[PDB]
Short mmCIF file of C-alpha atoms in Angstrom, two decimals:
data_model
loop_
_atom_site.label_atom_id
_atom_site.label_comp_id
_atom_site.label_asym_id
_atom_site.label_seq_id
_atom_site.Cartn_x
_atom_site.Cartn_y
_atom_site.Cartn_z
CA UNK M 23 0.00 0.00 0.00
CA UNK M 24 1.06 3.60 -0.59
CA UNK M 25 0.58 6.72 1.52
CA UNK M 26 -2.69 8.49 0.53
CA UNK M 27 -0.91 11.71 -0.48
CA UNK M 28 0.87 9.77 -3.28
CA UNK M 29 -2.32 8.10 -4.51
CA UNK M 30 -3.40 9.79 -7.74
CA UNK M 31 -7.03 10.84 -8.02
CA UNK M 32 -8.25 11.31 -11.66
CA UNK M 33 -8.90 14.98 -12.45
CA UNK M 34 -11.71 16.14 -14.80
CA UNK M 35 -11.11 16.21 -18.56
CA UNK M 36 -10.32 19.73 -19.79
CA UNK M 37 -12.77 20.89 -22.48
CA UNK M 38 -11.38 23.58 -24.85
CA UNK M 39 -12.48 27.20 -24.86
CA UNK M 40 -13.95 28.61 -28.06
CA UNK M 41 -17.21 29.59 -29.79
CA UNK M 42 -20.15 27.30 -29.04
CA UNK M 43 -20.22 24.17 -31.24
CA UNK M 44 -22.66 23.90 -34.21
CA UNK M 45 -25.01 21.25 -35.64
CA UNK M 46 -23.22 18.76 -37.88
CA UNK M 47 -25.72 15.91 -38.16
CA UNK M 48 -26.74 14.74 -41.65
CA UNK M 49 -30.38 15.77 -41.00
CA UNK M 50 -32.35 17.81 -38.43
CA UNK M 51 -32.97 15.98 -35.15
CA UNK M 52 -35.12 17.71 -32.48
CA UNK M 53 -35.78 20.63 -34.81
CA UNK M 54 -37.20 18.35 -37.53
CA UNK M 55 -40.76 18.98 -38.61
CA UNK M 56 -43.01 16.41 -40.26
CA UNK M 57 -45.74 17.00 -42.84
CA UNK M 58 -47.82 13.88 -42.73
CA UNK M 59 -50.72 12.04 -44.38
CA UNK M 60 -52.66 8.94 -43.25
CA UNK M 61 -52.01 6.11 -45.73
CA UNK M 62 -54.86 4.48 -47.74
CA UNK M 63 -47.15 1.79 -51.13
CA UNK M 64 -46.75 5.25 -52.73
CA UNK M 65 -43.78 6.54 -54.75
CA UNK M 66 -41.90 9.22 -52.73
CA UNK M 67 -42.52 12.21 -55.02
CA UNK M 68 -46.28 11.54 -54.99
CA UNK M 69 -46.25 11.11 -51.17
CA UNK M 70 -44.14 14.25 -50.86
CA UNK M 71 -46.54 16.38 -52.86
CA UNK M 72 -49.51 14.94 -50.99
CA UNK M 73 -47.79 15.62 -47.63
CA UNK M 74 -46.98 19.22 -48.65
CA UNK M 75 -50.65 19.82 -49.54
CA UNK M 76 -51.67 19.19 -45.89
CA UNK M 77 -49.93 22.47 -45.10
CA UNK M 78 -52.02 25.50 -45.97
CA UNK M 79 -49.67 28.38 -45.13
CA UNK M 80 -46.94 28.27 -47.74
CA UNK M 81 -45.67 31.69 -48.80
CA UNK M 82 -42.93 33.31 -50.89
CA UNK M 83 -39.58 32.30 -49.28
CA UNK M 84 -37.07 34.76 -47.85
CA UNK M 85 -33.79 34.35 -46.01
CA UNK M 86 -34.03 34.89 -42.25
CA UNK M 87 -30.56 33.84 -41.32
CA UNK M 88 -27.71 34.08 -43.84
CA UNK M 89 -25.18 31.32 -44.12
CA UNK M 90 -21.89 33.15 -43.22
CA UNK M 91 -19.64 31.31 -45.71
CA UNK M 92 -22.12 30.82 -48.62
CA UNK M 93 -23.91 32.56 -51.51
CA UNK M 94 -27.32 32.83 -49.90
CA UNK M 95 -29.37 33.83 -52.97
CA UNK M 96 -28.28 30.45 -54.50
CA UNK M 97 -29.93 28.63 -51.52
CA UNK M 98 -33.20 30.53 -51.88
CA UNK M 99 -33.14 29.88 -55.65
CA UNK M 100 -32.46 26.18 -55.03
CA UNK M 101 -35.66 26.02 -52.99
CA UNK M 102 -37.76 27.84 -55.62
CA UNK M 103 -36.21 25.44 -58.11
CA UNK M 104 -37.33 22.41 -56.03
CA UNK M 105 -40.89 23.75 -55.92
CA UNK M 106 -40.84 24.56 -59.66
CA UNK M 107 -39.77 20.98 -60.44
CA UNK M 108 -42.46 19.58 -58.14
CA UNK M 109 -44.96 21.68 -60.10
CA UNK M 110 -43.67 20.13 -63.34
CA UNK M 111 -44.06 16.64 -61.86
CA UNK M 112 -47.67 17.53 -61.06
CA UNK M 113 -48.44 18.85 -64.58
CA UNK M 114 -47.22 15.46 -65.82
CA UNK M 115 -50.21 13.10 -65.60
CA UNK M 116 -47.75 10.33 -64.62
CA UNK M 117 -45.71 10.71 -61.43
CA UNK M 118 -42.14 9.43 -61.98
CA UNK M 119 -40.28 7.14 -59.59
CA UNK M 120 -37.28 9.53 -59.73
CA UNK M 121 -36.70 13.15 -60.74
CA UNK M 122 -33.44 14.62 -62.03
CA UNK M 123 -33.19 18.37 -61.60
CA UNK M 124 -31.86 21.05 -63.93
CA UNK M 125 -28.14 21.55 -63.33
CA UNK M 126 -28.55 25.30 -62.82
CA UNK M 127 -25.79 27.56 -61.50
CA UNK M 128 -27.28 27.74 -58.00
CA UNK M 129 -27.22 23.91 -57.92
CA UNK M 130 -23.67 23.53 -59.28
CA UNK M 131 -22.43 26.02 -56.72
CA UNK M 132 -24.31 24.49 -53.76
CA UNK M 133 -23.20 20.98 -54.75
CA UNK M 134 -19.74 22.34 -55.42
CA UNK M 135 -19.85 20.81 -58.91
CA UNK M 136 -12.01 22.55 -39.32
CA UNK M 137 -9.67 22.29 -36.26
CA UNK M 138 -10.62 25.47 -34.36
CA UNK M 139 -11.75 24.60 -30.79
CA UNK M 140 -15.35 24.99 -29.78
CA UNK M 141 -16.92 24.94 -26.32
CA UNK M 142 -19.97 22.79 -25.52
CA UNK M 143 -23.36 24.41 -26.15
CA UNK M 144 -26.41 23.27 -24.24
CA UNK M 145 -28.39 22.37 -27.41
CA UNK M 146 -26.46 19.20 -27.48
CA UNK M 147 -27.75 17.70 -24.19
CA UNK M 148 -31.19 18.96 -25.13
CA UNK M 149 -30.85 16.85 -28.30
CA UNK M 150 -29.91 13.81 -26.21
CA UNK M 151 -32.83 14.38 -23.87
CA UNK M 152 -35.30 14.59 -26.74
CA UNK M 153 -33.95 11.40 -28.32
CA UNK M 154 -34.65 9.61 -24.97
CA UNK M 155 -38.30 10.78 -24.95
CA UNK M 156 -41.38 8.91 -26.28
CA UNK M 157 -43.39 10.05 -29.32
CA UNK M 158 -47.13 9.56 -29.73
CA UNK M 159 -46.28 7.24 -32.64
CA UNK M 160 -44.61 3.87 -33.06
CA UNK M 161 -41.65 3.48 -35.44
CA UNK M 162 -41.19 -0.28 -35.37
CA UNK M 163 -43.80 -2.97 -36.05
CA UNK M 164 -43.50 -6.78 -36.05
CA UNK M 165 -34.91 -13.71 -25.27
CA UNK M 166 -38.13 -13.40 -27.29
CA UNK M 167 -40.10 -12.48 -24.16
CA UNK M 168 -37.46 -9.85 -23.35
CA UNK M 169 -37.27 -8.64 -26.98
CA UNK M 170 -40.97 -7.74 -26.89
CA UNK M 171 -40.63 -5.94 -23.54
CA UNK M 172 -37.61 -3.97 -24.77
CA UNK M 173 -39.35 -3.43 -28.12
CA UNK M 174 -42.40 -2.28 -26.12
CA UNK M 175 -40.24 0.30 -24.35
CA UNK M 176 -38.39 1.78 -27.37
CA UNK M 177 -40.99 1.37 -30.16
CA UNK M 178 -42.26 4.95 -29.70
CA UNK M 179 -38.88 6.39 -28.64
CA UNK M 180 -37.65 9.46 -30.59
CA UNK M 181 -34.26 7.80 -31.16
CA UNK M 182 -36.02 4.98 -33.07
CA UNK M 183 -37.66 7.46 -35.44
CA UNK M 184 -34.12 8.69 -36.04
CA UNK M 185 -33.05 5.13 -36.80
CA UNK M 186 -35.88 4.83 -39.34
CA UNK M 187 -35.46 8.38 -40.83
CA UNK M 188 -31.77 7.46 -41.26
CA UNK M 189 -32.21 4.03 -42.82
CA UNK M 190 -34.67 5.46 -45.33
CA UNK M 191 -32.65 8.54 -46.36
CA UNK M 192 -29.32 6.65 -46.61
CA UNK M 193 -30.93 3.93 -48.71
CA UNK M 194 -32.68 6.44 -51.00
CA UNK M 195 -29.39 8.33 -51.36
CA UNK M 196 -27.26 5.22 -51.91
CA UNK M 197 -29.84 4.05 -54.41
CA UNK M 198 -29.70 7.34 -56.40
CA UNK M 199 -25.90 7.38 -56.09
CA UNK M 200 -25.74 4.10 -58.03
CA UNK M 201 -28.44 4.82 -60.63
CA UNK M 202 -27.84 8.45 -61.60
CA UNK M 203 -24.19 9.15 -60.94
CA UNK M 204 -24.07 12.51 -62.75
CA UNK M 205 -27.59 13.80 -62.28
CA UNK M 206 -28.78 15.98 -59.45
CA UNK M 207 -31.55 13.82 -58.02
CA UNK M 208 -34.41 15.17 -55.91
CA UNK M 209 -34.82 12.75 -53.00
CA UNK M 210 -37.76 13.37 -50.57
CA UNK M 211 -36.88 12.61 -46.94
CA UNK M 212 -39.56 10.20 -45.80
CA UNK M 213 -40.42 7.99 -42.84
CA UNK M 214 -43.42 5.71 -42.00
CA UNK M 215 -45.01 5.23 -38.51
CA UNK M 216 -48.20 4.05 -36.71
CA UNK M 217 -50.43 6.40 -34.66
CA UNK M 218 -52.15 5.63 -31.32
CA UNK M 219 -55.39 4.90 -33.19
CA UNK M 220 -53.44 2.36 -35.29
CA UNK M 221 -53.21 3.98 -38.80
CA UNK M 222 -50.18 3.86 -41.13
CA UNK M 223 -48.67 7.34 -41.53
CA UNK M 224 -46.28 8.84 -44.11
CA UNK M 225 -44.02 11.68 -43.04
CA UNK M 226 -42.18 14.28 -45.14
CA UNK M 227 -39.29 15.99 -43.43
CA UNK M 228 -38.04 17.78 -46.53
CA UNK M 229 -35.65 17.04 -49.40
CA UNK M 230 -32.08 16.05 -50.30
CA UNK M 231 -30.58 16.99 -53.68
CA UNK M 232 -27.80 14.48 -54.47
CA UNK M 233 -24.71 15.85 -56.22
CA UNK M 234 -22.29 13.91 -58.45
CA UNK M 235 -21.81 10.35 -57.17
CA UNK M 236 -19.05 8.37 -58.93
CA UNK M 237 -18.26 6.36 -55.84
CA UNK M 238 -15.47 4.08 -57.04
CA UNK M 239 -14.12 4.17 -53.45
CA UNK M 240 -15.75 3.71 -50.05
CA UNK M 241 -14.23 7.01 -48.89
CA UNK M 242 -15.33 8.87 -52.04
CA UNK M 243 -17.50 11.84 -51.10
CA UNK M 244 -20.92 12.76 -52.52
CA UNK M 245 -22.20 16.25 -51.72
CA UNK M 246 -25.86 17.06 -51.21
CA UNK M 247 -28.07 19.96 -50.18
CA UNK M 248 -30.48 19.18 -47.33
CA UNK M 249 -33.72 21.23 -47.13
CA UNK M 250 -35.71 20.57 -43.96
CA UNK M 251 -38.89 21.89 -42.40
CA UNK M 252 -38.79 23.17 -38.84
CA UNK M 253 -40.68 25.48 -36.47
CA UNK M 254 -37.39 26.39 -34.76
CA UNK M 255 -36.68 30.14 -35.03
CA UNK M 256 -32.90 30.28 -35.88
CA UNK M 257 -32.61 33.33 -33.68
CA UNK M 258 -33.03 31.26 -30.52
CA UNK M 259 -29.62 29.64 -30.99
CA UNK M 260 -27.63 31.20 -33.90
CA UNK M 261 -24.42 29.25 -33.10
CA UNK M 262 -26.21 25.95 -33.61
CA UNK M 263 -26.94 26.93 -37.22
CA UNK M 264 -23.44 28.05 -38.44
CA UNK M 265 -23.44 25.74 -41.48
CA UNK M 266 -27.05 26.67 -42.45
CA UNK M 267 -28.91 29.20 -44.48
CA UNK M 268 -32.43 29.38 -43.01
CA UNK M 269 -35.42 30.59 -44.98
CA UNK M 270 -38.97 31.29 -43.93
CA UNK M 271 -41.40 29.51 -46.18
CA UNK M 272 -44.72 29.35 -44.44
CA UNK M 273 -47.14 30.30 -41.68
CA UNK M 274 -48.17 27.47 -39.36
CA UNK M 275 -51.16 27.64 -37.01
CA UNK M 276 -50.59 26.21 -33.51
CA UNK M 277 -53.11 25.98 -30.67
CA UNK M 278 -51.11 26.98 -27.60
CA UNK M 279 -52.52 27.01 -24.06
CA UNK M 280 -53.78 30.59 -24.51
CA UNK M 281 -55.16 29.55 -27.91
CA UNK M 282 -54.45 29.44 -31.66
CA UNK M 283 -51.27 31.33 -32.65
CA UNK M 284 -49.64 31.71 -36.09
CA UNK M 285 -45.94 30.80 -36.10
CA UNK M 286 -43.38 30.78 -38.98
CA UNK M 287 -42.45 27.57 -40.73
CA UNK M 288 -38.74 27.61 -41.66
CA UNK M 289 -36.53 25.73 -44.07
CA UNK M 290 -33.05 24.77 -42.81
CA UNK M 291 -30.76 24.58 -45.83
CA UNK M 292 -27.16 23.47 -45.95
CA UNK M 293 -24.58 21.63 -48.05
CA UNK M 294 -23.27 18.47 -46.47
CA UNK M 295 -21.28 15.42 -47.60
CA UNK M 296 -21.39 11.63 -47.34
CA UNK M 297 -19.50 8.56 -48.54
CA UNK M 298 -20.49 5.08 -49.69
CA UNK M 299 -19.33 3.63 -46.34
CA UNK M 300 -21.14 6.34 -44.38
CA UNK M 301 -24.33 5.66 -46.36
CA UNK M 302 -23.85 1.94 -45.68
CA UNK M 303 -23.38 2.69 -41.94
CA UNK M 304 -26.59 4.71 -41.88
CA UNK M 305 -28.46 1.88 -43.63
CA UNK M 306 -27.23 -0.35 -40.76
CA UNK M 307 -28.63 1.83 -37.93
CA UNK M 308 -31.01 -0.97 -36.84
CA UNK M 309 -27.88 -2.49 -35.26
CA UNK M 310 -28.48 0.26 -32.64
CA UNK M 311 -31.59 -1.51 -31.44
CA UNK M 312 -29.66 -4.75 -31.27
CA UNK M 313 -26.64 -3.29 -29.45
CA UNK M 314 -28.78 -1.60 -26.81
CA UNK M 315 -30.78 -4.84 -26.44
CA UNK M 316 -27.56 -6.71 -25.62
CA UNK M 317 -26.55 -4.14 -22.97
CA UNK M 318 -29.93 -4.38 -21.17
CA UNK M 319 -29.69 -8.20 -21.32
CA UNK M 320 -26.33 -8.35 -19.53
CA UNK M 321 -28.02 -6.11 -16.93
CA UNK M 322 -30.61 -8.89 -16.35
CA UNK M 323 -27.81 -11.48 -16.08
CA UNK M 324 -26.01 -9.30 -13.50
CA UNK M 325 -29.28 -9.48 -11.52
CA UNK M 326 -29.76 -13.21 -12.31
CA UNK M 327 -27.25 -14.02 -9.55
CA UNK M 328 -30.00 -12.84 -7.17
CA UNK M 329 -31.66 -16.27 -7.45
CA UNK M 330 -31.84 -19.28 -9.79
CA UNK M 331 -34.29 -17.18 -11.86
CA UNK M 332 -33.59 -14.06 -13.98
CA UNK M 333 -36.82 -12.16 -13.13
CA UNK M 334 -36.92 -10.53 -16.60
CA UNK M 335 -40.65 -10.23 -15.90
CA UNK M 336 -40.22 -8.23 -12.67
CA UNK M 337 -37.04 -6.65 -14.08
CA UNK M 338 -39.30 -5.01 -16.72
CA UNK M 339 -42.48 -4.75 -14.60
CA UNK M 340 -41.03 -3.78 -11.21
CA UNK M 341 -41.35 0.02 -11.52
CA UNK M 342 -39.72 0.05 -8.06
CA UNK M 343 -36.48 -1.24 -9.61
CA UNK M 344 -34.47 1.86 -10.56
CA UNK M 345 -31.18 2.67 -12.22
CA UNK M 346 -29.23 5.97 -12.28
CA UNK M 347 -30.22 7.31 -15.74
CA UNK M 348 -29.03 10.89 -15.29
CA UNK M 349 -28.34 13.85 -13.01
CA UNK M 350 -30.03 16.91 -11.49
CA UNK M 351 -28.73 19.89 -9.42
CA UNK M 352 -29.67 17.74 -6.39
CA UNK M 353 -27.69 14.66 -7.44
CA UNK M 354 -27.83 11.47 -9.53
CA UNK M 355 -31.30 10.81 -10.98
CA UNK M 356 -32.70 7.26 -10.87
CA UNK M 357 -35.06 5.75 -13.46
CA UNK M 358 -37.22 2.83 -14.55
CA UNK M 359 -35.84 0.20 -16.96
CA UNK M 360 -37.82 1.76 -19.83
CA UNK M 361 -35.89 5.02 -19.36
CA UNK M 362 -32.71 2.88 -19.32
CA UNK M 363 -33.73 1.11 -22.53
CA UNK M 364 -34.32 4.43 -24.34
CA UNK M 365 -31.24 6.19 -22.90
CA UNK M 366 -29.02 3.33 -24.13
CA UNK M 367 -30.73 3.28 -27.52
CA UNK M 368 -30.28 7.09 -27.81
CA UNK M 369 -26.56 6.81 -26.93
CA UNK M 370 -26.18 4.12 -29.57
CA UNK M 371 -28.11 6.06 -32.20
CA UNK M 372 -26.20 9.27 -31.39
CA UNK M 373 -22.90 7.44 -31.78
CA UNK M 374 -24.16 6.61 -35.27
CA UNK M 375 -25.49 10.03 -36.28
CA UNK M 376 -22.37 11.74 -34.93
CA UNK M 377 -19.81 9.15 -36.02
CA UNK M 378 -16.36 10.72 -36.34
CA UNK M 379 -12.64 9.99 -35.83
CA UNK M 380 -12.74 12.12 -32.66
CA UNK M 381 -15.28 9.63 -31.21
CA UNK M 382 -13.17 6.67 -32.26
CA UNK M 383 -10.36 8.34 -30.33
CA UNK M 384 -12.47 9.38 -27.39
CA UNK M 385 -14.10 5.95 -26.91
CA UNK M 386 -11.08 3.67 -27.09
CA UNK M 387 -9.28 5.83 -24.48
CA UNK M 388 -12.11 7.09 -22.28
CA UNK M 389 -12.98 3.40 -21.70
CA UNK M 390 -9.53 2.71 -20.20
CA UNK M 391 -10.05 5.63 -17.81
CA UNK M 392 -13.60 4.68 -16.88
CA UNK M 393 -12.09 1.33 -15.73
CA UNK M 394 -9.54 3.07 -13.51
CA UNK M 395 -12.28 5.26 -12.08
CA UNK M 396 -14.47 2.20 -11.42
CA UNK M 397 -11.64 0.32 -9.73
CA UNK M 398 -11.10 3.39 -7.52
CA UNK M 399 -14.80 3.66 -6.75
CA UNK M 400 -14.45 0.07 -5.53
CA UNK M 401 -11.37 0.94 -3.36
CA UNK M 402 -9.23 -1.42 -5.42
CA UNK M 403 -5.70 -0.16 -6.26
CA UNK M 404 -5.50 0.21 -10.07
CA UNK M 405 -2.12 1.33 -11.41
CA UNK M 406 -2.33 5.02 -12.37
CA UNK M 407 1.21 5.26 -13.76
CA UNK M 408 0.06 6.00 -17.32
CA UNK M 409 -2.60 8.64 -16.57
CA UNK M 410 -0.50 11.44 -18.15
CA UNK M 411 -0.44 9.47 -21.43
CA UNK M 412 -4.14 8.64 -21.02
CA UNK M 413 -5.36 12.22 -20.47
CA UNK M 414 -3.21 13.19 -23.48
CA UNK M 415 -4.73 10.51 -25.75
CA UNK M 416 -8.24 11.55 -24.63
CA UNK M 417 -7.95 15.34 -24.58
CA UNK M 418 -6.45 15.28 -28.09
CA UNK M 419 -9.97 14.20 -29.14
CA UNK M 420 -11.60 17.17 -27.34
CA UNK M 421 -11.58 19.87 -30.04
CA UNK M 422 -14.96 20.90 -31.51
CA UNK M 423 -17.17 17.82 -32.12
CA UNK M 424 -20.36 18.40 -30.14
CA UNK M 425 -21.09 14.72 -29.33
CA UNK M 426 -17.56 13.99 -28.15
CA UNK M 427 -17.78 17.16 -26.09
CA UNK M 428 -21.05 16.22 -24.40
CA UNK M 429 -19.54 12.78 -23.67
CA UNK M 430 -16.44 14.35 -22.04
CA UNK M 431 -18.82 16.47 -19.95
CA UNK M 432 -20.84 13.34 -18.99
CA UNK M 433 -17.63 11.63 -17.93
CA UNK M 434 -16.60 14.56 -15.68
CA UNK M 435 -20.03 14.59 -14.07
CA UNK M 436 -19.79 10.84 -13.43
CA UNK M 437 -16.25 11.12 -12.08
CA UNK M 438 -17.36 13.87 -9.68
CA UNK M 439 -20.10 11.63 -8.25
CA UNK M 440 -18.03 8.39 -8.40
CA UNK M 441 -15.06 9.41 -6.22
CA UNK M 442 -16.72 12.16 -4.23
#
């Protein structure tokens, strides 16, 4: 044993100073806005048009927040172009399976035919929170006893919509990538769900315009413009929207508590990029449901040494059984197994949506340090001789990526409560 004053107690990770980090997902998450129709399957462009007709407040677009490093008139004109080409589709008595767009100057520019440190903004934890929540709709339809329980917990979870939204768009995009390598294809962003009252529903989030896609390599990059409905005023959090031009396209009527108010509908527009592999990873996002199912299953095994049984039944049904799912100003927050199912799904999904080299760094190394911290929590004596190295390997990955940043922050919170 060593004298306590020599014992090394892990310090918090240092997060860099800088401007607040910005959104860098492939599609809107909590800010997304669906235009939806109840189904009678349809071809996307027909469903898209139908979904857009359920909105009755469209108006002439205008820019409400410039993109700093872009030609903003080109983004407005790209939107008017989308609408003009949807009109043409209409005028055609036959709706086509696909639509190639005119390769105008606005489109060539937009489809083009960062190591500065950022601090952690709060939008990011808000995202995570919203992914853990339950929607009024189900996004999956049909060990096995436990599957259905788990499934019953996450079916309506916001992170599962994100899984589905992401398998559809990545498959549409990878599909267009192969079929129409040179054309600029107009891809509606669509998901399907079931309501409380049991109907099939088709949801339009907006539109991707695929750029050139000669993907001879996995790492080969295809650019795209994303155009996404939202009710989020971009003025609430300008830093979140650094990469975006935001237009105002519509007037949406919402019954608030005090009554019916009119609020702007916005279009979030940006250029973004993706690769064959990244598209393939997004098509594989259902693995997120499987991975978080495995984690919850080990958690039933680690409580199967309570008896000869496993008590999966009571494990899922014993609302008394609680797990630390979070934190408050007071202290660690405890939650039901449901909330654990969704939190672990949301983590898994968010590792997918925010995949990055920084995460691959942060995870391989933060893991080693979590072990040390756990050993210490347990008053074991783990060797700390390599902590210098370890902090270095971890903090190198703490630059500007919002997800990595939130994770570093989560670790420091945990560490504070674990050893203190």
